[PDB]
Amino acid sequence: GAEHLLEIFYLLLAAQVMAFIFKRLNQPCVIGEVLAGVLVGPALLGLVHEGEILEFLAELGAVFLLFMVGLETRLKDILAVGKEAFLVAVLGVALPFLGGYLYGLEIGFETLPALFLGTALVATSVGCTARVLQELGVLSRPYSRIILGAAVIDDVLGLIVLAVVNGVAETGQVEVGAITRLIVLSVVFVGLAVFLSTLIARLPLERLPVGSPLGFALALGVGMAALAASIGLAPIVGAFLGGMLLSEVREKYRLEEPIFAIESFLAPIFFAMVGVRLELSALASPVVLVAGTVVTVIAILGKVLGGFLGALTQGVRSALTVGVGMAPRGEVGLIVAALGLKAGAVNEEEYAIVLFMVVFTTLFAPFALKPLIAWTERERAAKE
Amino acid sequence: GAEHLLEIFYLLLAAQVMAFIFKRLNQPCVIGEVLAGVLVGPALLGLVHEGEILEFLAELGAVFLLFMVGLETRLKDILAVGKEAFLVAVLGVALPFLGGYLYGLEIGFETLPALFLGTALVATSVGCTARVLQELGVLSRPYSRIILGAAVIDDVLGLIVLAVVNGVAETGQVEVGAITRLIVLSVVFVGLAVFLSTLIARLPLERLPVGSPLGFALALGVGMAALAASIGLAPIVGAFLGGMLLSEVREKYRLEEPIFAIESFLAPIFFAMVGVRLELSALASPVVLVAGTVVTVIAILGKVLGGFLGALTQGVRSALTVGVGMAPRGEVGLIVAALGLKAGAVNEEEYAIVLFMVVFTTLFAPFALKPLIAWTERERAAKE
């Protein structure tokens, strides 16, 4: 009711104000839209509290947020690259996950809670890294295609891991059987989506008893997510594949703009509500600060070697650009933390740590990647 | 959760299918988007049931639906007319309200429930009537401006009535004092909005600590609705005035399209959920059919004289065009019925009647108004 209408108004308003601040600070994405949630949240103001309704508008936020990403993914542009991206993607999953789990047990975690920190480090922000390259306008360059190409695959792998970890979360001590079934269910469904998505362009929706091409995209997006839930996979990342289907007809039917108008509404709520859950005790906690800073460096170095050994193919100057470029975590890492806390496998202390590092990784991207792209362009300006 | 994601998917899907059907039947608006709700609803299929979440997504639907209308209202175009529209608007409120209340007591209603049927007959669909004139492309003609101009004012008056009726609904036997306060609160707030809205064009949002002109429109829209609720006025119609503010800067900042992309998402849910609440007993009820058909004719004739005596100024040929043009009820009439049922002042039998006539009035508009506009154009083609 009007209880929540108010609450939403304070969420949107605070997010707008915090957004104007951070764009003026030249820190593009997924920072102020959280701290705005902290601000308007219980911890500081308390104009908004977490209700079941505002928890759902946070789901649609994450759903539409990854639906937008799945809509902007071209499977022509990626295939010309991804062989070298799939080398980075596998390293992108492998290196930081161990960094989370191994280091996690040393901070006194259990079996399950340790896996969640790893999965939180597995993810990569595909949204923020693209934003950085857009202003530079350098994205057309190949070393940018690898980073984004890997980031797409990596986020899909971050789902399957998270899905398995949650399968072990729901039911403890789960045998490898239920795990292996998710891996098969995931791979086939994705491959079927990829397979179907390639067959979409040849099939216009005109025969479908549909009232308009926008409506069908939505109805398909929510349906693809709901079906993913019935299979026992995260609905958030079940919509991303529903957008891969429509990514080829993206321009033809005029989708990208309106679907972004919806997403630009709901996506703020998701990032705020994640900030709402943060605590005063959580922020500035003596052990969290140390281990939070440490695990952050573990995340970077893991990505450096992962973005080097995997990107080693193209060049030295390029390999470094990929190592730093895969640094940001952002959206999915929150969908991990957000998922883990609600299942009850994530402690308030852990949630602080995850929200601590994602902030500092996103802070690190423009302060680092920006001069490197310049230096790579210089070396290529000589040898061309 | 995935319970509702599913439910939403069946709502959107059914609405899309029912929309393709009705557009093919040449019955433009707010018919299949309800019966789709009946279809997927308990009464027939039962894939969707009414939860608290899907009741809220029905509110945002009605909110964004009237926010869209308030955004498309120009206060330059209206002022050149409205003197003759305000003659129709007052008749538009006066005639059918008595038709509801007087006739209502004869069907065995009480004091309060009788007022709701009247208020349900007070409203006019501004959305459907505009749609009809768009295809004909005749809307630029003046006799179309009166109908729409009156329809805008009428819907604002339909709010204040409904607000008073609800004030008497919440607390029984309410003294004229609390009623008179709402009338003052309503008139001033609207006049202030109208006053402010005229002062908006001179003031671009550029100085506001805002991240983007879309975000501010939303945050303002929800805020204007939430503030309306705290005053004890329907939030649904508190957003309409928040869009009047932005109606002058409508084109400048590129709002109309994206805000319609959101509304084209949420607005279906509102019309479906209204259909969901309908009953098998409600549909095809022996007394409902009679009184439902009767009160429908009472609604038309009330609008005929109201759209004649008020529109009598321009011409005979035009006066008839207005009488029929004000026939459709649509959106707000549901917001009445929907409001009345939840407060508990509306019986299942009454809800049937209101949803019965709005269907038959909307059905009546194209089957009637269409040839009349032609005949008015012919008489004007001779005398020009």
UniProtKB/TrEMBL annotation, chains A, B:
Pfam families (UniProt xref): Na_H_Exchanger
Domain Cation/H+ exchanger transmembrane: 15-375
InterPro entries attached to this UniProt entry: Cation/H_exchanger_TM, Na+/solute_symporter_sf
GO BP term, example: sodium ion transport
Chain sites annotated for binding Zn(2+) 2: 4
Keyword Manganese recorded: no
Gene Ontology cellular component terms for the protein in this record: membrane
Identification of the protein by name: Na(+)/H(+) antiporter
Organism whose genome encodes this protein: Thermus thermophilus (strain ATCC BAA-163 / DSM 7039 / HB27)
